[PDB]
Amino acid sequence: SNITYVKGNILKPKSYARILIHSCNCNGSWGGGIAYQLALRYPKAEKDYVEVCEKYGSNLLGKCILLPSYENSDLLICCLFTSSFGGSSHGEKQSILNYTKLALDKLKTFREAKDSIGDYLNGHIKYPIGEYKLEMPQINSGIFGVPWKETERVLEEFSGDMSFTVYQL
């Protein structure tokens, strides 16, 4: 299994380069959950996220955008665009699952290329890309109501390609 589970806050500051993967809406709202915490401590990353939502809207579904944290060069933010709207206006379960697989497949290809998705990055990537650990919360399982085992089966389709550390409550 390519998933490592840990109990704790993914946002607790860590000693190592890491890409923080989280599930996003196209509406320019980091309005809740981990996205809200990201909005409050990395406000320049939010501005990038909102701008790309402004530019493309729901043309982003199934795509991925890599953002520097700006305030910590060891930390990149990876937005999986899986829903048009956030909160209780989120998209249907299967669409979120499918879009999650699609955005993660763009990130997989981007990682192999370097060993739209990287345009805000150029110059904030200090280390080689294969050295950023891939970390995420239990994406889609809270506000979107997407059962974790269904999302786990999606992350499992990348065994060999990619390894993830998943933070849980």
Swiss-Prot record:
Q: Which organism is it from?
A: Saccharomyces cerevisiae (strain ATCC 204508 / S288c)
Gene3D superfamilies (alphabetical): Leucine Aminopeptidase, subunit E, domain 1
Family per similarity comment? Belongs to the POA1 family.
Kindly state which keywords UniProt assigns to this record, in alphabetical order. Hydrolase
The entry's substrate-binding residues are 8-10, 23-25, 30-35, 139-145
Its recorded reaction(s) are:
ADP-alpha-D-ribose 1''-phosphate + H2O = ADP-D-ribose + phosphate
Anything else of interest in the record?
A: Present with 1170 molecules/cell in log phase SD medium.
Return the GO cellular component terms, semicolon-separated: nucleoplasm
The EC category is hydrolase
Q: Where is the Macro domain?
A: 1-169
Do you know which CDD domains this protein is assigned to? Macro_Poa1p-like
Gene Ontology molecular functions: ADP-ribosyl-[dinitrogen reductase] hydrolase activity; phosphatase activity
EC number(s) of the enzyme?
3.1.3.84, 3.2.2.-
InterPro entries assigned: ADP-ribose_metab_enzymes, Macro_dom, Macro_dom-like
Pfam families the UniProt entry points to: Macro
Q: What is this protein called?
A: ADP-ribose 1''-phosphate phosphatase
Q: What does this protein do?
A: Highly specific phosphatase involved in the metabolism of ADP-ribose 1''-phosphate (Appr1p) which is produced as a consequence of tRNA splicing. Removes ADP-ribose from glutamate residues in proteins bearing a single ADP-ribose moiety. Inactive towards proteins bearing poly-ADP-ribose.
